[PDB]
């Protein structure tokens, strides 16, 4: 009984090993008050940016 | 005008703006006799912001 039971315990125990958990998800977030991108200004001349 | 609008979720719109105006500088309208003459606004730029 005793080698039965470690035997077939270790051998589940390799054989589950395959087994990924983990994941990545994607969250998506609008902005409201402000934009997104990397922003251009013109002076009288002159492009500016800010990140 | 160039611009570019933005939907903010208060019901505003937000605007980047370039404004651009006025009449060409003419030295060849030499004449006195026109005294009539076509009204005379300036040249201006304005850059800006605004909500």
Redesign the interface.
Same mark, same amino acid.
């Given at each position: 009984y005793v080698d039965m039971v470690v035997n077939a315990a270790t051998m589940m125990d390799k054989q589950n090993d395959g087994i990924e958990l983990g994941r990545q998800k994607i969250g998506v977030m609008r902005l409201?008050?402000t934009?997104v991108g990397d922003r251009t200004?013109?002076?009288?001349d002159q492009k500016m940016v800010i990140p | 005008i160039r611009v570019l609008p933005?939907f *903010?979720?208060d019901g505003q719109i937000e605007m *980047?703006l370039?404004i651009e105006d006025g009449n060409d500088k003419t030295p060849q309208s030499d004449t006195t006799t026109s005294v009539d003459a076509l009204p005379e606004v300036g040249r201006t730029?304005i850059?800006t912001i605004a909500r």
């Open positions: 409201n008050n934009f200004y013109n002076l009288r | 933005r *903010s979720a *980047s370039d730029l850059s």
